[PDB]
Structure 1
Amino acid sequence: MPVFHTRTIESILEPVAQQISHLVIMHEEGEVDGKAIPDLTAPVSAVQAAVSNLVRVGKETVQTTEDQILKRDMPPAFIKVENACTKLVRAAQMLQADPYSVPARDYLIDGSRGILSGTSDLLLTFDEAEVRKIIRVCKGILEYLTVAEVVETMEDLVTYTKNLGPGMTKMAKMIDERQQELTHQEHRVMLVNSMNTVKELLPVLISAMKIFVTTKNTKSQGIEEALKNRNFTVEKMSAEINEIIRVLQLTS
């Protein structure tokens, strides 16, 4: 009912959510009363297997995961989809004995709805997890920006620049690829701008620490001035990164 979120979520659930909305409108919402639904035994068994298989895989995902909200959050969705399958199975039994059965049609709507919504749940929970893996990269880079303040030698700065390399390269490849999977344009804009600001400020940071190391080893100059520019680059990078983390959590 609200937009699916990512291109994967939307392309999985969109055919289903479409077909359901129709089927409602039709039978339910008045309209095709005294109607007659054909025999669903075969399609409902196919669904029932696909829910075995989904709960199979998902229970592996659950026991074989590092993520702690993944562990706790997924299971309920297994309970939601199994329940909904149960309704679909009574639906098709009832319909076999009375094509015109109005309880059966209702079970089939709720059945279908609960399959859509439990799998929505399972996919949001999986996606939250994936977002957290980008947030970890973002948070560790923020942690490392905290430490720029302590570089004082050219050798520390060589070391600092070499650890912070991988980190920004990875953050950037993550946000870029994530941005592509997004379905809200106000959200892709935001991520990309932020990552652009970040990427362009990186050499500004390195230059500003070089300036700093260099007046802190030429025993004087204007060192206040050099340090506050460094502190401003670091705060601007931090703030952008904090926005990246925020906007990644947006779903609408």
Structure 2
Amino acid sequence: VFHTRTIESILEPVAQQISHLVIMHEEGKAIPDLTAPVAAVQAAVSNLVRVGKETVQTTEDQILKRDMPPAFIKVENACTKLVQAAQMLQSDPYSVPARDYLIDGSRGILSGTSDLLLTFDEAEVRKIIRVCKGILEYLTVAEVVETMEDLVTYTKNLGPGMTKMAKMIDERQQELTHQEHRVMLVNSMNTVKELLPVLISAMKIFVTTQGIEEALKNRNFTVEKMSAEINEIIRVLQLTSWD
């Protein structure tokens, strides 16, 4: 239901209670005084909005500056509906709009916290994508390597770059809830790592060499296969649904 184990742990217990509450209200007693638990919701919302507003002002990521403020409004407005429901139930424990204001307030808080969490996740995924694109671009440089000096420089750059990408993917896949997505990330990453020494070997033969056309074909083939896997990783990293 939630694509990462952080979002799942945080939201799924509360998302299940809200669904249940909606089903109960549809088919179907006095609601007790909700003053103390609503105040706890208010104190948490106030902290989230204050810290959130501070992030909006300091960040350089224009997407956060754009997507975070509407989500705050969503959580703030939903909290206002919750504060109204508790004030209604204190005066009337059998109140009808109070039960609707609780549902509306719960839905809105979950909606806004979901938006916030998804926005933070898209931002982390953008960071991984930048590292992937970096590798893709460095794979395009392979075709201009003509000498052993260049091969040594290329190998010293690509080697650590691949290790950082492999570590980012390994850590991202552990965090995912859907198995089909984890398998695709692991499979593609393994192929990339396996084909890297094969690329360096193909380029060594090219630096060594009719005969040139064969060594060039194999180097271009490896870059093509590695590039296709990297572009598949970029695609899979952006998936939030279904399998």
Do both proteins adopt the same fold according to a TM-score greater than 0.5, normalized to the shorter chain?
A: yes
Give the 3-state SS of the residue equivalent to 1:36 in structure 2.
Answer: coil
Q: How does 1:1-252 map to 2 (within 5 A)?
A: 3-29=1-27, 35-215=29-209, 222-252=211-241
- Deviating above 6 A after TM superposition, structure 1's stretches of 4 or more consecutive aligned residues are none
Deviation at 1:28, TM superposition (A): 3.6
Deviation at 1:15, TM superposition (A): 1.5
Deviation at 1:230, TM superposition (A): 0.3
Deviation at 1:25, TM superposition (A): 2.2
Deviation at 1:210, TM superposition (A): 0.5
Give the 3-state SS of the residue equivalent to 2:32 in structure 1.
Answer: coil
The answer to which of 192-201 and 61-70 deviates more is 61-70
CA distance in 2, matches of 1:65, 1:166: 28
CA distance in 1, matches of 2:202, 2:53: 50
CA distance in 2, matches of 1:60, 1:28: 40
More helix by share: 2
Give the 3-state SS of the residue equivalent to 1:27 in structure 2.
Answer: helix
Deviation at 1:62, TM superposition (A): 2.0
CA distances 1:42-65 after superposition (whole Å, capped 9, x unpaired)? 111110110111112222222222
Deviation at 1:27, TM superposition (A): 3.1
8 Å contact from structure 1 (residues 81, 114) kept in 2: yes
The answer to which of 90-99 and 14-23 deviates more is 14-23
Deviation at 1:38, TM superposition (A): 0.6
Deviation at 1:196, TM superposition (A): 0.4
8 Å contact from structure 1 (residues 80, 118) kept in 2: yes
CA distance in 2, matches of 1:104, 1:77: 23
Identity of aligned residues (%): 99
CA distance in 1, matches of 2:26, 2:87: 19
CA distances 1:156-215 after superposition (whole Å, capped 9, x unpaired)? 000000111221111110111100111111100100000000000000110010011011
CA distances 1:95-138 after superposition (whole Å, capped 9, x unpaired)? 00000001001000110011111100000011000000000000
Cα RMSD, aligned residues only: 1.2
Name the TM-score, length of structure 1 as normaliser.
Answer: 0.93
CA distance in 2, matches of 1:11, 1:101: 33
Deviation at 1:66, TM superposition (A): 2.9
Give the 3-state SS of the residue equivalent to 1:96 in structure 2.
Answer: helix
Distance 1:133 1:17, change over 3 A: same
Deviation at 1:22, TM superposition (A): 2.1
Deviation at 1:139, TM superposition (A): 0.3
CA distance in 2, matches of 1:227, 1:131: 34
CA distances 1:69-103 after superposition (whole Å, capped 9, x unpaired)? 12211111001000000000000000000000010
> Which 5+ residue runs of structure 1 have no aligned equivalent?
216-220
Deviation at 1:6, TM superposition (A): 0.4
8 Å contact from structure 1 (residues 27, 35) kept in 2: no
8 Å contact from structure 1 (residues 145, 238) kept in 2: yes
Would you say how many aligned residue pairs link Structure 1 and Structure 2?
241
CA distance in 2, matches of 1:129, 1:197: 26
CA distance in 2, matches of 1:202, 1:116: 44
CA distance in 2, matches of 1:189, 1:206: 27
Name the TM-score, length of structure 2 as normaliser.
Answer: 0.96
CA distance in 1, matches of 2:211, 2:46: 70
CA distance in 1, matches of 2:55, 2:164: 24
